[PDB]
Amino acid sequence: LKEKAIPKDQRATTPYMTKYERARILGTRALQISMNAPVFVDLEGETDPLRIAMKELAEKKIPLVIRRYLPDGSFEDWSVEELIVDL
Amino acid sequence: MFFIKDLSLNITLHPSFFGPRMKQYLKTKLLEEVEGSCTGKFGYILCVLDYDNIDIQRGRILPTDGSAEFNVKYRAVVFKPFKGEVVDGTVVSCSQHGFEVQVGPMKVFVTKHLMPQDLTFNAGSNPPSYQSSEDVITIKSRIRVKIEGCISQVSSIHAIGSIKEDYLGAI
Amino acid sequence: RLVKALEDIMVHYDNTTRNSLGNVIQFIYGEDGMDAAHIEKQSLDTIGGSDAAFEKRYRVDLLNTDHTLDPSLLESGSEILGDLKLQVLLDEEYKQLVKDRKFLREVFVDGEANWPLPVNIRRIIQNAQQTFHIDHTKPSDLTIKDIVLGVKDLQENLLVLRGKNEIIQNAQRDAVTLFCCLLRSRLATRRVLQEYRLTKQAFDWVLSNIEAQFLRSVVHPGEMVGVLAAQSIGEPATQMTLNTFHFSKKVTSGVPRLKEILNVAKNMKTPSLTVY
Amino acid sequence: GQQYSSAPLRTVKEVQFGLFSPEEVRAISVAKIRFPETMDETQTRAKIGGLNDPRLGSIDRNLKCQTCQEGMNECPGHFGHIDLAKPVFHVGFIAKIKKVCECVCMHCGKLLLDEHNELMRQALAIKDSKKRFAAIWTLCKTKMVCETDVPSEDDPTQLVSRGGCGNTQPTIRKDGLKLVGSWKDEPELRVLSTEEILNIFKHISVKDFTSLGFNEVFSRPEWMILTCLPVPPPPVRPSISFNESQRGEDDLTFKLADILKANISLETLEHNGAPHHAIEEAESLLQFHVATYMDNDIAGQPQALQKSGRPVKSIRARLKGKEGRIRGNLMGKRVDFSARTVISGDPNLELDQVGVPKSIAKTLTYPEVVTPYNIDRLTQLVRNGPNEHPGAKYVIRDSGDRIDLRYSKRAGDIQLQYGWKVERHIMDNDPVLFNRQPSLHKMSMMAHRVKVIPYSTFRLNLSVTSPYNADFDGDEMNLHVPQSEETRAELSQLCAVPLQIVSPQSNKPCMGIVQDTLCGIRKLTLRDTFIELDQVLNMLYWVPDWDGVI
Amino acid sequence: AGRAALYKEVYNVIASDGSYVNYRHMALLVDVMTTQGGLTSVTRHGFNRSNTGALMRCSFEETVEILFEAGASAELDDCRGVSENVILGQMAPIGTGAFDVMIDEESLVKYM
Amino acid sequence: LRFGEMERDCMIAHGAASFLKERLMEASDAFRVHICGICGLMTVIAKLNHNQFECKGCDNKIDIYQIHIPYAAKLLFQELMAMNITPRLYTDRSRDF
Amino acid sequence: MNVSTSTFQTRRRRLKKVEEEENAATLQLGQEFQLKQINHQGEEEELIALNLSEARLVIKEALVERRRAFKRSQKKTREKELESIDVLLEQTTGGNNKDLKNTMQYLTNFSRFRDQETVGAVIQLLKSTGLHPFEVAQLGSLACDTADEAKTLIPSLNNKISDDELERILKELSNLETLY
DNA sequence: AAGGTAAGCTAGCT
RNA sequence: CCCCCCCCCCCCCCC
DNA sequence: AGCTAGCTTACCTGGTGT
Ligand SMILES: [Mg+2]
Ligand SMILES: [Zn+2]
Ligand SMILES: [Zn+2]
Ligand SMILES: [Zn+2]
Structure with a gap:
């Protein structure tokens, strides 16, 4: 029943990115870069996957989406691009 | 029979393929696996339709490895043979036991005992034939067969057919 | 036992606190929606003191020659005296500060003012005074509308729960009630102008920072708040020497009483009644 | 474990608990299990067609599973069966079996209280399966007659037949592993046979059993009575096979042979000129071993002692926690990539660092994938080898097979390929988990940055002492090395020592300045404390971040 | 009032030994013991007798007797507890696991 | 060295889900089983080499899955089946929350 | 598996x-x-x-359009029918797919209706019959002269259609048959 | 030289 | 199955 | 001899390593 996908308009979760999202995004991207995945940022002499991932996140060039599940099973999708990285 | 079915494969893509020619690689991997395949469930998955409109959807990233899994929704032409389906085909092989008829992707075998009793084998012909007072069934002839049952093996389906009944036989 | 009983409690993407069945334990984590590490003991000023002491601190009466803001406090000083439309705004302000004081004296019945709350306002003002090199000599470029409305507007942005509906919207108001009591008591017109000698540029910076800090302060969905609470009660109990010394009633305490409580022991050691 | 499988990889979303129908046990079974013997097929050291691999899995490193033909680290082992000569109660269900009897007519198999009784209707109404059963039981237990007729919902003057026989109901009491009833000058006392209970349970309606705690698909009440016993494969009951001419059989293997032996004696007895009350002797024994195999620590009964007078581990026993499968092997495990040594303090370490003895760095490794960024660094590390500090221990090819850099004839001529893994030594600045047990705090486990150092102790900054609750009077600490880029991020981004400074437990910092520093800070900051130029310059130079401005 | 009293008592024990534990932690415990009908103890008879996952409840105090009742009454573990994913060697819906991560082909192409 | 129950708790409190999984799988136990999609048991006869699967007494050679679980859990499951209890593992949700 | x-x-x-x-x-x-x-x-x-004739056209269409897509990504009659098809397969398929090559030769050699125009008209005719898609496909694939031939080879048709209504349809089909 | 409890069940109260 | 080993922090007063 | 009172009884009891 894909009535569980909550539309872009009417999305009540935080516009800010949670610590856990950031940690999983960096971890994911670093692991992907580590396994010879294409990089979306110009590495300015960088060679560490975590540091390359932090660069990708700073320049908002991480092609990932967080699927935020709600208690009933419904969910909201948030583009890493759109989430506020204050912290 | 010969159907158009809506189907969906799950494909795991390694991070090295997370480039802009991504959807491309996915669609080709789909055809590599799916096209030319044969299950007992759906039959022979012969040709995938609407290449331009194959639904990739979002790919969830698998936890400890990098790779991401996509459920590729697609629609294709399938061939599922059935008992009692009357099929038109070409004789491919011929022995003391009978003859095999090619029906599209598959073969249907006709037993000596599932033919009219008048029809009899003749090894002393090049190539071996089944001779009757009227017709001669040999390595190139067109036959109308009635499927009596199927067996699903590895990456094919084989069947046994009769030409005993009315309106069946050489065409 | 504490850990095994709380394991599965976590803060969800709706700020609700639920278990493995998705049953609601708390409607918002810790009744306020804040992460415990972003909280500091702060004094709610309005609560205490003489009623006359409160009046002197907060009351601005532009319709009284001895109770206006002196033209040494702000540029608008001379032109503001006797303005009826602004007194409406300032009466509005003062009535809220009185309402708040009554409300606080209801919550904290004994008049305790020091309560742990998010956003250390004292420090923000200090940093503003430093950053801007505020001179407690020259009249401010703030207007009554600048202070009064600035605060009014900041309150609208102190978001714990997002959601278009009266249930969540009321829920949001409820959650911020106490912080706002502090915020209004600390950013009142007479204080902003006479105590801290804030400029428009400076007051703006204070407001922007309270907002940024307030949002940083909110709990993060995914917080394994259940284990956290179990470990938080658990570990201080291991550092308990007790029982209740070697001697106002000789009541059972420390580990044996905690044991009594968690077990929901029917026949307890020291049953007692306190009759007022 | 290991080797590619074409099967779709998925996760468990649900666990459906239930009971085995005898029909299932037989259908799952790879072998019939007939002989109490383990092997020596006329002395020949090789498993028998009777017990342990009559097709169940290997004892030897044979690579012959017979069933999957897979071999040890791959074959999960396959269940067999034992067809029991007479039915037997499952120890665990004895009381439920008893309670069910107390709710049903022990003759016609009907529910003792119809949806006619008002209090019964209330019980039926109960949504929770477990709670409902307790309500039906307390109501039904006391109903000692199966009513033929009952007063109608309308006028009780006109009684209506609800169905069922008339029969008196026994007052059941448990005696050992048997159930004895009592009907009503003087009562009739007779033991209720396993066969008897089973026949009644097979006759309990689906509506009736589903009204009680039961389920038509997964757990029918009749299934609490064992008819066909599943035989676990060798992986559950390892034959610790020391040498050629020496055994090593597991406790369970012997208990099963006892079960088997008990079963053959009964079947032989019952088939032959059965002296009926010599049958009930061998039958009570079969019940005892099937019972004592699952649970040996049975309430008020003699424990099934081994030859040695050693109680014999029941399966139940292996699952009972704190060192016991669930808590022992599942909620906690012993782990690889871990190290432990004595801790000692160091003022010259950064708050978030941890001093790691060279020995430990040379043992603990991190599997780093060969990428164009590190292809050069890694080749040097491999060249350095397993014995020089910045070095590596293994190279892992695309193939999956490991190259041991301390034995390979090609150890000095490895040309790394992108995608390979180098299991390099733990190096400076790697995130690692550091812990001091009892870990009663989230702070009792924190991520530190490595610092490879001489001497055999872990070294830590004194201000980190407080959250760990550690002294240096011989305290030991654990270190765990993450193996993924994904888990390294987890450590650095969530549980790094600096992140833990201010604790959510009490809304204040959990680390501060202590001891020497706290003592000397008071001393240094007194009014009479004055510092001459010489000392001032060194005090200044000691602060790393110093502006260079006196 | 039971909840209020229960906190008041729990607090008074922590406060007695000098120490201070933030309101929320004790609130959460006091709330768990309360959210059902009345006073659910932090014991084998208390919380462990809740309608949670068979696999999670067995991981504390009654193990086998639990799994036996789970079998008899055909219980279905939803696998949403931490304990279940721990037994299953699966990533639990805890913090880092409380959401999912997806590649968007759209943005992937856009960034190149 | 022991990554015990108490250590599992700190990891939960931190929110380190992947770290917790790695500790309990890759760093210890981790095993691969073939589960039947119908009866949900570890019954599958994976002759993974000839690419043959099969759960007889289901007559299923189609609906088969592979799962990664701690070997100790595989052991647990066999031990429960050993005592007539069926712990059926399913890769899809029947209920829904 | x-x-x-x-x-x-x-x-x-x-x-x-x-x-x-x-x-x-x-x-x-x-x-x-x-x-x-x-x-x-x-x-x-x-x-x-699909009756053979339809299936022949579906595959051809699909394969032709695929060739078009493969040419976008590259940037940045009777016996001749067989000859040509085996060249389209060379270009769009994996060659290893022997099943499709076998099918194409079969379909090309056994189709009753060549052009799309006629297939559309066959579809239109059998559309109205209210028969099962399988019976409708078999009526398009199997060439029958009498309603007896049809009802014998397609047993399911039995009481579903009049003998003459079926015989009327059978004439329309033999008329619609392509002269190869 | 356990302790507290939640079942259960005998003995002995109508 | 023992055993030990580890832990054994803090603090009596005076404003 | 309806019910209940006083029994009796299983369940658990910190962490790590000769
Ligand atoms: Mg010590
Ligand atoms: Zn095997
Ligand atoms: Zn009856
Ligand atoms: Zn199965």
């Missing part, structure tokens, strides 16, 4: 018996080939059975 293809038909196959039944011309095809199918959009859609 392998990572095979799923479908849009959702099964409730929980422990329960292999209650599976026969496949015939009682029109009992699989659950997979039920009349009431569900498309990727979730909408219920009727079963798509």
Whole structure:
């Protein structure tokens, strides 16, 4: 029943990115870069996957989406691009 | 029979393929696996339709490895043979036991005992034939067969057919 | 036992606190929606003191020659005296500060003012005074509308729960009630102008920072708040020497009483009644 | 474990608990299990067609599973069966079996209280399966007659037949592993046979059993009575096979042979000129071993002692926690990539660092994938080898097979390929988990940055002492090395020592300045404390971040 | 009032030994013991007798007797507890696991 | 060295889900089983080499899955089946929350 | 076995018996080939059975359009029908797919109706009959002269259609037949 | 030289 | 199955 | 001899390593 996908308009979760999202995004991207995945940022002499991932996140060039599940099973999708990285 | 079915494969893509020619690689991997395949469930998955409109959807990233899994929704032409389906085909092989008829992707075998009793084998012909007072069934002839049952093996389906009944036989 | 009983409690993407069945334990984590590490003991000023002491601190009466803001406090000083439309705004302000004081004296019945709350306002003002090199000599470029409305507007942005509906919207108001009591008591017109000698540029910076800090302060969905609470009660109990010394009633305490409580022991050691 | 499988990889979303129908046990079974013997097929050291691999899995490193033909680290082992000569109660269900009897007519198999009784209707109404059963039981237990007729919902003057026989109901009491009833000058006392209970349970309606705690698909009440016993494969009951001419059989293997032996004696007895009350002797024994195999620590009964007078581990026993499968092997495990040594303090370490003895760095490794960024660094590390500090221990090819850099004839001529893994030594600045047990705090486990150092102790900054609750009077600490880029991020981004400074437990910092520093800070900051130029310059130079401005 | 009293008592024990534990932690415990009908103890008879996952409840105090009742009454573990994913060697819906991560082909192409 | 129950708790409190999984799988136990999609048991006869699967007494050679679980859990499951209890593992949700 | 293809038909196959039944011309095809199918959009859609002639054209069309897509990504009659098709397959298929080459030769050699124009008219005719998609496909693939031939080879038709109505349709089809 | 409890069940109260 | 080993922090007063 | 009172009884009891 894909009535569980909550539309872009009417999305009540935080516009800010949670610590856990950031940690999983960096971890994911670093692991992907580590396994010879294409990089979306110009590495300015960088060679560490975590540091390359932090660069990708700073320049908002991480092609990932967080699927935020709600208690009933419904969910909201948030583009890493759109989430506020204050912290 | 010969159907158009809506189907969906799950494909795991390694991070090295997370480039802009991504959807491309996915669609080709789909055809590599799916096209030319044969299950007992759906039959022979012969040709995938609407290449331009194959639904990739979002790919969830698998936890400890990098790779991401996509459920590729697609629609294709399938061939599922059935008992009692009357099929038109070409004789491919011929022995003391009978003859095999090619029906599209598959073969249907006709037993000596599932033919009219008048029809009899003749090894002393090049190539071996089944001779009757009227017709001669040999390595190139067109036959109308009635499927009596199927067996699903590895990456094919084989069947046994009769030409005993009315309106069946050489065409 | 504490850990095994709380394991599965976590803060969800709706700020609700639920278990493995998705049953609601708390409607918002810790009744306020804040992460415990972003909280500091702060004094709610309005609560205490003489009623006359409160009046002197907060009351601005532009319709009284001895109770206006002196033209040494702000540029608008001379032109503001006797303005009826602004007194409406300032009466509005003062009535809220009185309402708040009554409300606080209801919550904290004994008049305790020091309560742990998010956003250390004292420090923000200090940093503003430093950053801007505020001179407690020259009249401010703030207007009554600048202070009064600035605060009014900041309150609208102190978001714990997002959601278009009266249930969540009321829920949001409820959650911020106490912080706002502090915020209004600390950013009142007479204080902003006479105590801290804030400029428009400076007051703006204070407001922007309270907002940024307030949002940083909110709990993060995914917080394994259940284990956290179990470990938080658990570990201080291991550092308990007790029982209740070697001697106002000789009541059972420390580990044996905690044991009594968690077990929901029917026949307890020291049953007692306190009759007022 | 290991080797590619074409099967779709998925996760468990649900666990459906239930009971085995005898029909299932037989259908799952790879072998019939007939002989109490383990092997020596006329002395020949090789498993028998009777017990342990009559097709169940290997004892030897044979690579012959017979069933999957897979071999040890791959074959999960396959269940067999034992067809029991007479039915037997499952120890665990004895009381439920008893309670069910107390709710049903022990003759016609009907529910003792119809949806006619008002209090019964209330019980039926109960949504929770477990709670409902307790309500039906307390109501039904006391109903000692199966009513033929009952007063109608309308006028009780006109009684209506609800169905069922008339029969008196026994007052059941448990005696050992048997159930004895009592009907009503003087009562009739007779033991209720396993066969008897089973026949009644097979006759309990689906509506009736589903009204009680039961389920038509997964757990029918009749299934609490064992008819066909599943035989676990060798992986559950390892034959610790020391040498050629020496055994090593597991406790369970012997208990099963006892079960088997008990079963053959009964079947032989019952088939032959059965002296009926010599049958009930061998039958009570079969019940005892099937019972004592699952649970040996049975309430008020003699424990099934081994030859040695050693109680014999029941399966139940292996699952009972704190060192016991669930808590022992599942909620906690012993782990690889871990190290432990004595801790000692160091003022010259950064708050978030941890001093790691060279020995430990040379043992603990991190599997780093060969990428164009590190292809050069890694080749040097491999060249350095397993014995020089910045070095590596293994190279892992695309193939999956490991190259041991301390034995390979090609150890000095490895040309790394992108995608390979180098299991390099733990190096400076790697995130690692550091812990001091009892870990009663989230702070009792924190991520530190490595610092490879001489001497055999872990070294830590004194201000980190407080959250760990550690002294240096011989305290030991654990270190765990993450193996993924994904888990390294987890450590650095969530549980790094600096992140833990201010604790959510009490809304204040959990680390501060202590001891020497706290003592000397008071001393240094007194009014009479004055510092001459010489000392001032060194005090200044000691602060790393110093502006260079006196 | 039971909840209020229960906190008041729990607090008074922590406060007695000098120490201070933030309101929320004790609130959460006091709330768990309360959210059902009345006073659910932090014991084998208390919380462990809740309608949670068979696999999670067995991981504390009654193990086998639990799994036996789970079998008899055909219980279905939803696998949403931490304990279940721990037994299953699966990533639990805890913090880092409380959401999912997806590649968007759209943005992937856009960034190149 | 022991990554015990108490250590599992700190990891939960931190929110380190992947770290917790790695500790309990890759760093210890981790095993691969073939589960039947119908009866949900570890019954599958994976002759993974000839690419043959099969759960007889289901007559299923189609609906088969592979799962990664701690070997100790595989052991647990066999031990429960050993005592007539069926712990059926399913890769899809029947209920829904 | 392998990572095979799923479908849009959702099964409730929980422990329960292999209650599976026969496949015939009682029109009992699989659950997979039920009349009431569900498309990727979730909408219920009727079963798509193809007479050889249709299937020939579907595949050809699909393959031709695929060649077009492969040319975009590259940037940045009777016996000749067989000759040509085997060249399109060289370009769009993996060659290793012997099943499709075999099918194409069969379809090319056994199709009653060549051009799309006629296939459309055949579709239009059998459309109205109200018969099962399978019977409609078999009527397009099997050449029958008498209603007896049709009803004998397609047993399911039995009481579904008049003898003369079927015989009327059979004439329209023999008339619509391409002269190769 | 356990302790507290939640079942259960005998003995002995109508 | 023992055993030990580890832990054994803090603090009596005076404003 | 309806019910209940006083029994009796299983369940658990910190962490790590000769
Ligand atoms: Mg010590
Ligand atoms: Zn095997
Ligand atoms: Zn009866
Ligand atoms: Zn099965």
